[PDB]
């Protein structure tokens, strides 16, 4: 299918390790976008403002180590665009990250 | 207007021109040398790849201080770059030339860039300020560009 | 489109700073049509322009 939506968890700690203080949250957004592109094969990746707030919750340098996100591939068939598919990345609040798998989520 | 290198048969050929274009003459000359002789579709996709930094133009004559890249090995060279503005200007000129070919009624799937030439335009003066109350030039280096496409397959 | 004038007029009418002026991000065209302080007042009455509350500076810790 191509209108699939899945729930992933991302090791922001792993993807941000080594980045300077004033760059950690922007680089976390860039790595989330790159992760979405790699997983869903869509150059068009939109990041929800709630997800952006979740990443920036603890300031610019103390980004959360792990984050639970939901990647939804959706039809871009609303206008004449080079890409007919886009990935919306939303924020999934969780209480713990233990034993969380990548799961297909229904409609 | 007078082009240099008039076509051998001005019925299988179309022309494009631009004057006082605000792009760097050296980068544009290197890009034109890169796309010279290409089929029009190949040149279009190559210029798009240059904009996307997937193919480089080799800097052969104006290579002072130009860094090395892995994509320069496609050409017999070592130094290459990705002049985005030169690529976009040449893409606009190629679209204009393809429209001229459409107007002349010759199919645009067999056009090859046989002539392309970049000339220096009159420089435009701006001003910069130096250490001890001194003024120095901040010239631009615009270029005229011309190209002649010809049908062959 | 560009609502610098509307933000300035809303600040002047609401007697607050431009920090506290909230323009509706969805009714951009309706706010952009407002070029006078009467129209700014009408938008304030209709709820498209809102004075945001003062950022909380509590004194409970001090007490």
């Amino acid at each position: 299918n191509e209108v699939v939506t899945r729930e992933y968890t991302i090791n922001i700690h792993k993807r941000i390790h080594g980045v300077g203080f004033k760059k950690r949250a922007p680089r976390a957004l860039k790595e989330i976008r790159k992760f979405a592109m790699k997983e869903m094969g869509t150059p068009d990746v939109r990041i929800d403002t709630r997800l952006n707030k979740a990443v920036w919750a603890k300031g610019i340098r103390n980004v959360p180590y792990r984050i639970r996100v939901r990647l939804s591939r959706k039809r871009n068939e609303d206008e004449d665009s080079p890409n007919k598919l886009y990935t919306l990345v939303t924020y999934v609040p969780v209480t713990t990250f233990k034993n969380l798998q990548t799961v297909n989520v229904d409609e | 207007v007078r082009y240099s290198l008039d076509p051998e048969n001005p019925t299988k050929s179309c022309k494009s021109r631009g004057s006082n274009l605000r792009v760097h003459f050296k980068n544009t000359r290197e890009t034109a040398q890169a796309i010279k002789g290409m089929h029009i579709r190949k040149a279009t996709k190559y210029l798009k790849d240059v904009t996307l930094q997937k193919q480089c133009v080799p800097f052969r004559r104006y290579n002072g201080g130009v860094g090395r890249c892995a994509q320069a090995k496609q050409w017999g060279w070592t130094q290459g770059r990705w002049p985005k503005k030169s690529a976009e200007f040449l893409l606009h000129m190629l679209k204009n030339a393809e429209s001229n070919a459409e107007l002349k009624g010759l199919d645009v799937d067999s056009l090859v860039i046989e002539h392309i030439q970049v000339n220096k335009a009159p420089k435009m003066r701006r001003r910069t300020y130096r250490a001890h109350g001194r003024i120095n030039p901040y010239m631009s280096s615009p270029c005229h560009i011309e190209m002649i496409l010809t049908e062959k397959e | 489109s560009m609502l610098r004038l509307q933000k300035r007029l809303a600040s002047s009418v609401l007697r607050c700073g431009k920090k506290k002026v909230w323009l509706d991000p969805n009714e951009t065209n309706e706010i952009a049509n407002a070029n006078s302080r009467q129209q700014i007042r009408k938008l304030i009455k209709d709820g498209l322009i809102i004075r945001k509350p003062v950022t909380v500076h509590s004194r409970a810790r001090c007490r």
């Binding site: 707030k53 | - | 909230w22 509706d24 209709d46 709820g47 809102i50 945001k52 509350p53 909380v56």
Partner: protein, 31 residues
Amino acid sequence: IMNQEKLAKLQAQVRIGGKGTARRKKKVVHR
């Protein structure tokens, strides 16, 4: 009057910010 469809979308328009921001009071059109 309020039904389930009206309530579920009303929650969206009254929220104009994250936690700790004032809620929207009204959005009235009048010509």
